[PDB]
């Protein structure tokens, strides 16, 4: 016998969506009230932070979860999208590793665009 098998890999085209050096707006204007660090501690709530995501979230509690997986469970209907995303947040007041959620995207209801050219 043998111990290797199973395997799979596929993505798409994405290098970046133009912009230029340095940045012309840190994800980090301000965000939140963002008061802790050897000045205000109050708890061992997570504090406003950002990974991977430019996008920062507000200040939390531990133990909690800032998931936001679609905005209804409707199946088949016109969503909102309000910043879908998945990110726990542990009982010792951090967050997790980095935002995710692609079990929002894939849905049993979408199928448009192709386009196409022909001689």
């Not at 012309?24 to 709530?45: A, D, K, M, V, W």
Request: aromatic share 12%.
């Amino acid at each position: 016998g043998s111990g290797m098998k199973e395997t799979a890999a596929a993505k798409f085209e994405r290098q970046h969506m133009d912009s230029p050096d340095l940045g012309t707006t840190l994800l980090e204007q301000y965000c939140h009230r963002t008061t802790i660090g050897n000045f205000s501690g109050p708890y061992t709530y997570c504090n406003t932070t950002l990974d991977q995501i430019g996008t920062c979230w507000p200040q939390s509690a531990p133990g909690a979860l800032v998931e936001r997986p679609c905005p209804e469970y409707f199946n088949g209907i016109k969503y909102n999208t309000t910043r879908n995303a998945y990110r726990e947040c542990l009982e010792n007041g951090t967050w997790a590793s980095r935002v995710n959620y692609s079990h929002c995207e894939p849905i049993l209801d979408d199928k448009q665009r192709k386009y196409d050219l022909h001689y």
